[PDB]
Amino acid sequence: XXXXXXXXXXXXXXXXXXXXXXXXXXXXXXXXXXXXXXXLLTTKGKATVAFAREARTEVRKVIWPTRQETLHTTLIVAAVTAVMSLILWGLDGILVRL
């Protein structure tokens, strides 16, 4: 079961189409994906399916919407970005000035 990656290769070459050599390279790598698919892939499929059950299991640890922790994070990163920018200004204004 390596089929979905090759369908994704078809989709990625179709995205790369719309200027001929790059679309040909995307098609060539899609052909390489099919060559890998010509002959583990079903075990990779079942592994990723297991990983998606694990994903959901780990979704249960994802903290649901909180506007407060959002604003905490928000203001933290806004503050930190302002800090780095003030660092950057204190350095490059007088350094470029000099």
């Binding site: 995205x15 780990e58 928000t74």
Partner: protein, 401 residues
């Protein structure tokens, strides 16, 4: 003290950001050009080393590029697989051999430039011509600069805090920002930049950061229980304490790694005119194409598995749990608990690096739609938010101590 470690690293990186035969104005003209998106990428990775035309032009990118290489030598060359696993001694000889691969990589990369990039006093300058005295002085100044940065980063990882190099480039791009935003608001009074799209890029930046911090909010805490009565009789409970295991670690390692491995072959390999097929392949190697970012992603996730597997050593953690007196009722201690935490941590962190690659890919489509390049990039937004978050959490964490 602890106050002096932070103000020593701060001072070191402040004279780094001041110090960070080629007429540089010509290059400053060349960086206003599309179709080589990777140049702008080199000024992010360089946080502006080739915009400022630094003395160290590509930075610390060779060093990180060796740290992956050796991990291959752990796999291949079992004689090498035995010396990597050989314990304490031998490792500092491997670290000096990583240094010696770096140094021959800086030699090799200077060859790659002065063969590949130049062959014109626009790409070169007036003092440094295609003679081997100019070639040699060029290589000498660029390798001496990268060595200075290598030594300074071997003093800051040890007697200073964390990484540092991340923050070096990071402050290079934040201080590269005000002209770039000056240009955007000059083109905002022009119809080049439309005001709807520019506030759209400001809000997509804000919502991707929100997604980052949402991936950071819920982690996964495993409640383990301790039944403990201290023999002093001041006995209260059987207490269930969660181990709040966290996702992706201390600087997304395959992003920085993958970026060094992206930017090495486009200068050295693809720039050989004299061979022609190799030059054509280098020209194709443009990050306007989905193939490169897919292969980079596959690299990153595999590399992420490896790096994370490096970070934790689950048996020590498990021994600690036996030492600290907590138990998950029903699972055999040791290997089964080991195997358990390992499979689960893999399955989580893999999803983490996946969504990391998802937040990584979209800004590039934003950069195709807007015309953005190595500036607001899908790789660097994430790494800057996580370095700042990490260090301030580690600062509060070590402020309790």
């Amino acid at each position: 003290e602890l106050k002096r470690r932070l103000l020593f690293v701060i001072g070191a990186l402040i004279v780094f950001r001041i110090g960070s035969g080629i007429d540089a104005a010509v290059l400053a003209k060349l960086l206003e050009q599309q179709r080589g998106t990777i140049i702008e990428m080199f000024n992010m990775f360089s946080g502006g080393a080739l915009s400022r035309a630094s003395i160290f032009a590509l930075g610390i990118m060779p060093y990180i590029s060796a740290s992956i290489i050796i991990q291959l030598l752990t796999v291949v060359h079992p004689t090498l697989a035995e010396i990597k696993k050989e314990g304490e001694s031998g490792r500092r000889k491997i670290s000096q051999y990583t240094r010696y691969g770096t140094l021959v990589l800086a030699i090799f990369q200077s060859i790659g430039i002065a063969t590949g990039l130049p062959n014109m006093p626009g790409m070169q300058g007036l003092v440094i011509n295609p003679g081997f005295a100019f070639y040699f002085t060029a290589v000498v100044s660029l390798v001496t600069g990268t060595m200075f940065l290598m030594w300074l980063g071997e003093q800051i990882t040890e007697r200073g805090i964390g990484n540092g190099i991340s923050i070096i480039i990071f402050a290079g791009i934040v201080a590269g920002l005000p002209p770039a935003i000056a240009h955007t608001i000059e083109q905002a009074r022009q119809g080049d930049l439309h005001f709807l799209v520019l506030l759209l890029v400001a809000v997509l930046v804000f919502a991707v950061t929100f997604f980052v911090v949402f991936v950071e909010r819920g982690q996964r805490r495993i409640v383990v229980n301790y039944a403990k009565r201290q023999q002093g009789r001041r006995v209260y409970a059987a207490q269930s304490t969660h181990l709040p295991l966290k996702v992706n670690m201390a600087g997304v390692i395959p992003a920085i790694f993958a970026s060094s491995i992206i930017l090495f072959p486009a200068t050295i390999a693809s720039w050989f005119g004299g061979w022609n097929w190799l030059t054509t392949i280098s020209l194709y190697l443009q990050p306007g194409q989905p193939l490169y970012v897919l292969l980079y992603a596959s690299a990153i996730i595999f590399f992420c598995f490896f790096y994370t597997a490096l970070v934790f050593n689950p048996r020590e953690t498990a021994d600690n749990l036996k030492k600290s007196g907590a138990f998950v009722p029903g699972i055999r201690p040791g290997e089964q608990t080991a195997k358990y935490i390992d499979k689960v941590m893999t399955r989580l962190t893999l999803v983490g690096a996946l969504y990391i690659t998802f937040i990584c890919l979209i800004p590039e489509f934003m950069r195709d739609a807007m015309k953005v390049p190595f500036y607001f990039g899908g790789t660097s937004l994430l790494i800057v938010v996580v370095v700042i978050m990490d260090f301030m959490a580690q600062v509060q964490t070590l402020m309790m101590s």
